[PDB]
Amino acid sequence: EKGDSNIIGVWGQGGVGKTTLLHVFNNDLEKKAHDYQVVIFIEVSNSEALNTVEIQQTISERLNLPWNDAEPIAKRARFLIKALGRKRFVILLDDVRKKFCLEDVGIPTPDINSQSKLILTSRYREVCFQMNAQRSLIEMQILGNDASWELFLSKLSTETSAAVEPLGSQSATREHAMKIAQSCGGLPLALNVIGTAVAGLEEGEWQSAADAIATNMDNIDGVDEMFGRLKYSFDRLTPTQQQCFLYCTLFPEYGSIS
């Protein structure tokens, strides 16, 4: 609302709620009154080759336009640029990964003279800077300890939760849950994966599971897909940069390096 720049960029670690934030924001826009006629949600992360046809189809569907199959891409881009030129639109790009011309797909770059706002998210600050959104940038901070704990219970069965939830009486299971929740580091996707994998605890093995999870995260279920989802950010770097990144892991856990 207050922002003087029509392009808003959000960046953060993979799976820290960027897509979730866009979903909740888009759903909450219907509560408030606004002058924006159309709100468009676009998922660009479908490919790193900029699959333009899907984006054009989504925009055309959102504007009640008659989609055509044989129309050339450039002519459609001009047609949508003219179409979006008379409407105050809110387009929500999700997880953009490489710089791409907005006019190429058909999205007109909003200017101060127009009331349209553009919101995009990314895993990289550099690509957000490439979108002329260097001054609507917000870093997605990880969730707090209280938020992480309350989210952790939502992914546990009560036969386990009623074994951990109660206060007053102190049991080792609650402290083990403290270790596990803090080990996930407040990253919501990591909390979801671990909590789903740890929804089935009974009392006996709470100690050993907490002991091992603090050291080796491979053995707990569901982590392979989590790493695969987070694997891409490493893969984008050059082999020299990759070797530099893996050299940083040798420093002690929860430390600080100059």
């Binding site: 009392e203 002991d211 091992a212 053995n219």
Partner: protein, 458 residues
């Protein structure tokens, strides 16, 4: 789970991490391949259909099995079937004599537990067993183990409840050995000064053994720095004092046994406070035992199993009421303690489930005269021969009670059982009819319902 994870660790299927074994068990139970079943969650079982499916998969697999457990086999199968398989299991059988020498090069695991009639084996049985990794001879009546110098890959041994007399010196030639279990050895006499020969050992066990570390002279485990869990049976105070200096060896005593102890008139958990891994404590036949001290010092160790046996001189155990190390106690067994007359502190054990008492003719009540019942998780109480047990305790909530057995308790007039509690988990109650009739009940429904639904007369 402890046995199965141990065999998995010895087999090499696990990277020296037991928690991954727990994880694999979780994957199996979550896929309904296995089902947890038992008094505690520590025991699981396999369904009959799943067992048949596993046998069928073995038949379709290249790795043939020769598994004949629990069919009461009186004569072991000929060596022809053994020579090609990879894993053999003949547990829970009635095998008497074993004569053939197998030619099993590919066999890696053997299971010959629960064989009361098995007492003798042919010499040279182990020569062809170059690939063996897991070996068990528990719950048998053998006295000696034949030559096993050809076992270049054994890691696990378990001779629990076995009347072994002397360990052959061939074991010290095995540098790959990892686990030894020698509990409940009533005929054991070999010295443990020879254990220093091995270097890569992880676990020992001398719990409830006829011969243990009787003096400081026998204590030479400092050489084995690879050990993580040990079982030790103490016979004199000097062993405990020598164990009472700060070193990783001292803190590794997870479970402790006291048998035929001399000059052990008193014992303090402060003397045991150097041990952060101690859970189980067994005391049997110590003449000196006069008093036991349970200090308020909350040692990180979480004792869960306590058993006191044959202590005519044991007078009392002092337990701090506000905060004590016994708050983690899972089970109590007190046997033959005629002078023990102060056990009221049991009411402070909120995590107590199983009780067995026998011939402790000095205890008036288990509890004599937080906003919760003292025993909400209580499951089992056993009393036998208690001549001077006037009562058990005051009425308390036992929602999880399942089994109760009391015999030969003439002074036992009342029990904390009442109809005010909910009854949906109880399954069986044992005891003599005369004692049941002699009991005094606050409500007659406590008699009719119990005697018609879950009372099992002897």
């Amino acid at each position: 789970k402890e046995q199965l994870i141990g065999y998995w660790l010895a087999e090499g299927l696990l990277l020296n991490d037991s928690e991954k074994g727990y994880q694999i068990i979780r994957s199996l139970v979550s896929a309904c391949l296995l089902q947890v079943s038992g008094s505690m969650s520590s025991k699981v079982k396999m369904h009959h259909v799943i067992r048949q499916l596993g046998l069928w998969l073995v038949n379709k697999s290249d790795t043939k099995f020769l598994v004949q457990p629990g069919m009461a086999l009186d004569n072991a199968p000929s060596a022809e079937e053994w020579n090609e398989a990879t894993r053999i299991s003949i547990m829970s059988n009635n095998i008497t004599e074993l004569s053939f020498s197998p030619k099993c090069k590919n066999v890696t695991t053997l299971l010959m537990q629960n064989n009361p009639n098995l007492n003798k084996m042919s010499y040279g049985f182990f020569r062809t067993m170059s690939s063996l990794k897991v070996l068990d001879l528990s719950h048998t009546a053998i006295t000696s183990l034949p030559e096993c110098d050809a076992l270049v890959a054994l890691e696990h041994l378990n001779l629990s409840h076995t009347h072994i007399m002397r360990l052959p010196e061939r074991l010290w030639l095995l540098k790959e050995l990892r686990h030894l279990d020698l509990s409940v050895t009533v005929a054991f006499e070999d010295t443990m000064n020879n254990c220093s020969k091995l270097h890569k050992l992880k676990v020992l066990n001398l719990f409830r053994s006829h011969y243990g570390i009787r003096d400081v002279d026998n204590l030479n485990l400092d050489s084995l720095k690879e050990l993580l869990f040990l079982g030790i049976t103490i016979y004199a105070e000097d062993v405990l004092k020598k164990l009472n200096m700060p070193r990783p060896l001292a803190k590794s005593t997870h479970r402790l046994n006291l048998k035929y102890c001399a000059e052990m008139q008193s014992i303090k958990i402060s003397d045991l406070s150097h041990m952060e891994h101690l859970e189980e404590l067994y005391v049997e036949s110590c003449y000196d035992l006069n008093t036991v001290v349970a200090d308020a010092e909350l040692t990180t160790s979480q004792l869960q199993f306590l058993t006191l046996s044959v202590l005519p001189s044991l007078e009392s155990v002092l337990v701090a009421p506000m905060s004590h190390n016994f708050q983690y106690i899972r089970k109590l067994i007190i046997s033959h303690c005629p002078k023990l007359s102060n056990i009221t502190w049991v009411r402070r054990l909120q995590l107590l489930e199983r009780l067995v008492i026998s011939h402790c003719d000095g205890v008036l009540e288990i509890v004599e005269d937080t906003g919760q019942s003292d025993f909400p998780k209580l499951r089992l109480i056993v009393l036998t021969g208690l001549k001077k047990l006037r009562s058990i305790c005051k009425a308390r909530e036992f929602p999880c009670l399942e089994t109760l057995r009391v015999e030969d308790c003439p002074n036992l007039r009342s029990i904390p059982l009442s109809c005010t509690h909910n009854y949906w988990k109880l399954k069986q109650i044992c005891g003599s009819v005369e004692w049941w009739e002699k009991l005094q009940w606050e409500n007659r429904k406590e008699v009719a319902c119990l005697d018609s639904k879950y009372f099992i007369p002897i």
